[PDB]
Design a protein around this nucleic acid. Structure first.
Ligand SMILES: COC(=O)[C@H](O[C@H]1CC[C@@H](n2cc(C)c(=O)[nH]c2=O)C1)P(=O)(O)O
Ligand SMILES: OC[C@H]1O[C@@](CO)(O[C@H]2O[C@H](CO)[C@@H](O)[C@H](O)[C@H]2O)[C@@H](O)[C@@H]1O
Ligand SMILES: [Mg+2]
Ligand SMILES: [Mg+2]
Ligand SMILES: [Mg+2]
Lengths: 412, 551
DNA sequence: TACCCCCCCTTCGGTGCTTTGCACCGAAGGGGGGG
């Protein structure tokens, strides 16, 4: 018995119509079990083919969870409500959250089931549950409450959220709290023992307001950037200098001070690739000044809140993965490298799945946005396996790219 | 009485006003016969000229029967009717059926006509009935039920049927009912006396809601005819497949043949359609006749020898693992078998899609593994364990070095040749003592004339004139030259991003005959190192050979 | 001379980087199949 906030899509835009993809047996059972008890609790209610809209649905297990969690792919719906979570009820982003020594992520999504949803908007939350071997046609539902994973859900609940928090934000003044959809980010400069305690205090502080918490521990101060680096060799071959000159040529689009004239001079003959070429005085100095320019930050790179974030990922082999987050090409807001994630030396798709989650998490902490990914993988390969390794309650936007490594710019 | 389904038109649009087709006198009498009986039952109604719509109507006789089908052309109503969301997400496959002690198959008589249409929407179904002459006008009618020919008839029937069956399924949890349109496959582990009793409770429960189960459609004894299959107590097979015997084949002949062969491929192992399909490409008219190649003839020959001997599939045992075994068939063709007990197939199939201009067998095998995984998750809800004709070390070399992410689920090597292999290996480091060829190419955009050549450190040189070429082709051609004019080990420097992208992915097949010749050379070499440098940076032999071939 | 669903093979046109050529993908029209 609560007032329903009215929600309307973006101007001149129709709801989401996205086909449902095949589900494994263990995922369908989990959905049918989850969707049953959600219906006897009024949270969802069956519908029919008169509703033209549809969204994909599936189930995940968070890291170490052991328990199924329902995940809806509201990416198409969230793009068509974009005015809502930006214009009026948006959440400002705390620039100090990335500076805290420890940050914990909690699933507060179970609280969104408290608030009802505008009746005129429920027609857009429609999802279909498939059946093994198409034994049954599609069992369709729709959401009566705030759905988990909708970008409108945390905005509506914010008024109720900021009230439950206010007693604890006053009892602990300098502890930072941020809300990105179904997750709550809470960080302190306290020691680890003190930090984990205040989370339990925040868990109870949520229990008496009616919420469970089925937490992830981060350390943003630990996070490191990966700069462009030039090799160290005692002797340079023609091929070494050719690779170097090409790399500096590429890097010059980012750092304009890069020079290659004195290093190009060393190649001017027609030499065998393995021939050793002693460096001239001027090449050694052109090299040294180049190494220093790459040490510098890029001039005029800063975050723009109106602009979307893009992330490119490159597979370096031997479990190494490098990434760059940017808004304008060659103006990188962050560059980084992962190694020995789950799946190293056995599974590419699992590692890439882990990298996308890590990069998205970092982007939520640092800018409160999830980037659009450029995935080094074929479409059919990614869409076949990624749901088996997805451990998050959000899903970033992605596209598929095929960029042969002409030059190894980000990893030596 | 079953709850009506609310329907609407596309907002701001009105109903269907289109004039009738001229109907044949043999069809009209059988048509007017069927229409008149409907009014007795409340399925159709007479309407006054107050209703201003009209839609064409016709009839064709039912397949495998004497009666006619009342088909209403609603194409213009369909354009202006609201959009639906179909609940028919696929087709069941018999290989996904568990074994049941007793099985029944029953069809509903007049499926759409037993479901009442939306009250407010009924008016838009307006159509008029012809006569033996053009003098009598014929009564105009509105549908009280789902019409055959509407775009909302299937979805509304399918979802309604589910709400009817839901109570029975919850009262009888151990009954498996495969619901596809109006046909119902019902099976149980119950003893057949008890099974037929529960069958009758369901026929009553459908009769509870006005759904008729005719005896003629009802089948009590194997082999059941279901979804175009024949279901036996422990085996299944397709209903027999008729291959046209035509002596001269048109385009529609091959299309019929190919489609039949694809249908056969689900259970008959090893069907191949590559050479037959090559005849289908780029033909203007369906009526045109095209001869059978000596390749396509041999393929149609061995395809018939597979269909000659009868085959059957088994049923699914959830306790045991799923196995999928793939064999290479050549020219980008692959067949597979899914089974649980050896030599007792559940189903078969084939992957033959040529994805991309240049590829290799490993990529294609991976695509086959992905097609099989998804089909398996559709039918059984799990991923099978794989038996693949590729050495463990081949795959380890491929997926680790390739620059894109790739993977195959749990799999083991099966020694059934022809094996999938990588046909050459580019060095990671330049080769000491191998001649260093700096290649380049160039072409004039208007002349379409170009050059391709190289310079080496040993003084070797060549330039070749080229007709009707492109910039990209001369760059590949320059690399071809360096491969021809070099020893078994060679370092090659290019500034062609395009060429290097193709060769580094280690293709073993190509649409381009030039790439196929480059591949042929690469297999011949012992050590090849490709390196890239940027153009017009005054680098080494690259600058020299750019001067030669630009002139 | 109708409707809905799945599958394969081909064509063709949008799309973006490999650049005004070439490569990729998806919509669509051909067929098989279900009802
Ligand atoms: O099939 C069936 O069972 C028939 O069912 C209804 C459900 C789909 C409908 N249907 C069917 C065909 C074959 C067809 O070409 N067109 C068509 O609209 C009729 P039926 O009751 O006439 O036997
Ligand atoms: O929707 C088109 C097509 O792509 C998929 C997944 O690749 O769509 C999802 O991902 C897109 C890219 O991030 C989103 O833009 C889209 O909203 C989301 O549905 C599949 O659903 C579909 O096959
Ligand atoms: Mg029937
Ligand atoms: Mg039927
Ligand atoms: Mg050139």
């Amino acid at each position: 018995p609560i007032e329903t906030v009215p929600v309307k899509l973006k101007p001149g835009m129709d709801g989401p119509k996205v086909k449902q993809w095949p589900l494994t047996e263990e995922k369908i059972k989990a959905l049918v079990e989850i969707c049953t008890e959600m219906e006897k609790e009024g949270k969802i209610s069956k519908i029919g083919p008169e509703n033209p809209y549809n969204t994909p649905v599936f189930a995940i297990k968070k890291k170490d969870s052991t328990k199924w969690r329902k995940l809806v792919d509201f990416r198409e719906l969230n793009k068509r409500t974009q005015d809502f979570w930006e214009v009026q009820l948006g959440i400002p982003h705390p620039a100090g959250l990335k500076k805290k020594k420890s940050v914990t992520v909690l699933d507060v999504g179970d609280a969104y089931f408290s608030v009802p949803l505008d009746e005129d908007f429920r027609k857009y939350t429609a999802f279909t549950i498939p059946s093994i071997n198409n034994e049954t046609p599609g069992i369709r539902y729709q959401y009566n409450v705030l759905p988990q994973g909708w970008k409108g859900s945390p905005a509506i609940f914010q008024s109720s959220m900021t009230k439950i928090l206010e007693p604890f934000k006053k009892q602990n003044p300098d502890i930072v709290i941020y809300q990105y959809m179904d997750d709550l980010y809470v960080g302190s400069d306290l020691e680890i023992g003190q930090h984990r305690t205040k989370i339990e205090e925040l868990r109870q502080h949520l229990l008496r307001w009616g919420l469970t918490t089925p937490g992830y521990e981060l350390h943003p101060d630990k996070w490191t950037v990966q700069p462009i680096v030039l090799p160290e060799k005692d002797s340079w071959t023609v091929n070494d200098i050719q690779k170097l000159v090409g790399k500096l040529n590429w890097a010059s689009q980012i750092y304009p001070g890069i020079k290659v004239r004195q290093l190009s001079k060393l190649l001017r003959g027609t030499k065998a690739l393995t021939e050793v070429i002693p460096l001239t005085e001027e090449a050694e100095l052109e090299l040294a000044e180049n190494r220093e320019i790459l040490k510098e930050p890029v001039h005029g790179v800063y975050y723009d809140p109106s602009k979307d974030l893009i992330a490119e990922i490159q597979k370096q082999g031997q479990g190494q993965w490098t990434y760059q987050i940017y808004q304008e090409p060659f103006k990188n807001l962050k560059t980084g490298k992962y190694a020995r994630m789950r799946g190293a030396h056995t599974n590419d798709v699992k590692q890439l799945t882990e990298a996308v989650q890590k990069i998205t998490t970092e982007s939520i902490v640092i800018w409160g946005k999830t980037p659009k990914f450029k995935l080094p993988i074929q479409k059919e390969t990614w869409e076949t396996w990624w749901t088996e390794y997805w451990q998050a309650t959000w899903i970033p936007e992605w596209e598929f790219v095929n960029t042969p490594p002409l030059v190894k710019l980000w990893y030596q | 009485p079953i709850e009506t389904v609310p329907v609407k038109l596309k907002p701001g649009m009105d109903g269907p006003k289109v004039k009738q087709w001229p109907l044949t006198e043999e069809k009209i009498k059988a048509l007017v016969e069927i229409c008149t009986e409907m009014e007795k039952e409340g399925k159709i109604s007479k309407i006054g000229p107050e209703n201003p719509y009209n839609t064409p109507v016709f009839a064709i006789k039912k397949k495998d029967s004497t009666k006619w089908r009342k088909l209403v052309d609603f194409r213009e109503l369909n354009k202006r009717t609201q959009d639906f969301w179909e609940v028919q997400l696929g087709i069941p496959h018999p290989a996904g059926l568990k074994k049941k002690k007793s099985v029944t198959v029953l069809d509903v008589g007049d499926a759409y006509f037993s479901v009442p249409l939306d009250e407010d929407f009924r008016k838009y179904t307006a159509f008029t009935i012809p006569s033996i002459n053009n003098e009598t006008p014929g009564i105009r009618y509105q549908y009280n039920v789902l019409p055959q020919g509407w775009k909302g008839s299937p979805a509304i029937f399918q979802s309604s049927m589910t709400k009817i069956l839901e109570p029975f399924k919850k009262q009888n949890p151990d009954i498996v009912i495969y619901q596809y349109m109006d046909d119902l496959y019902v099976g149980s582990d119950l003893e057949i006396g008890q099974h037929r009793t529960k069958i009758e409770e369901l026929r009553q429960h459908l009769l509870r809601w006005g759904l008729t189960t005719p005896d003629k459609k009802h089948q009590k004894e194997p082999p059941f005819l279901w979804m175009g299959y024949e279901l036996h107590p422990d085996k299944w097979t397709v209903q027999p497949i008729v291959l046209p015997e035509k002596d001269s084949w048109t385009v529609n002949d091959i299309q019929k043949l190919v489609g039949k062969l694809n249908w056969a491929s689900q259970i008959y192992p090893g069907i191949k359609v590559r050479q037959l399909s090559k005849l289908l490409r780029g033909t203007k008219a369906l009526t045109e006749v095209i001869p059978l190649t000596e390749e396509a003839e041999l393929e149609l020959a061995e395809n018939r020898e597979i269909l000659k001997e009868p085959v059957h599939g088994v049923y699914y045992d959830p306790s045991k693992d799923l196995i999928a075994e793939i064999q290479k068939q050549g020219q980008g063709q692959w067949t597979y078998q899914i089974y649980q007990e050896p030599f007792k197939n559940l189903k078969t199939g084939k992957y033959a899609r040529m994805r991309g201009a240049h590829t290799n067998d490993v990529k294609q095998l991976t695509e086959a593994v992905q097609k099989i995984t998804t089909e398996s998750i559709v039918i059984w809800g799990k991923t099978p364990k794989f038996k693949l004709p590729i050495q463990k070390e081949t795959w380890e070399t491929w997926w680790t070095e390739y620059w894109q992410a790739t993977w195959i689920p749990e799999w083991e090597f099966v020694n059934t040749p022809p094996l999938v292999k990588l046909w050459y290996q580019l060095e990671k480091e330049p080769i000491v003592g191998a001649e260093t060829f700096y290649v380049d190419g160039a072409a004039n955009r208007e002349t379409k004339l170009g050059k391709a050549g190289y310079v080496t450190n040993k003084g070797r040189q060549k330039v070749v004139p080229l007709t009707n070429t492109t910039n990209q082709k001369t760059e590949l051609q320059a690399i071809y030259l360096a491969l021809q004019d070099s020893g078994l080990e060679v370092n090659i420097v290019t500034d062609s991003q395009y060429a290097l992208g193709i060769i580094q992915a280690q293709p073993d097949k190509s649409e381009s005959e030039l790439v196929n010749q480059i591949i042929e050379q690469l297999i011949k070499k012992e050590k090849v190192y490709l390196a890239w440098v940027p153009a017009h940076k005054g680098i080494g032999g690259n600058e020299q050979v750019d001067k030669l071939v630009s002139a």
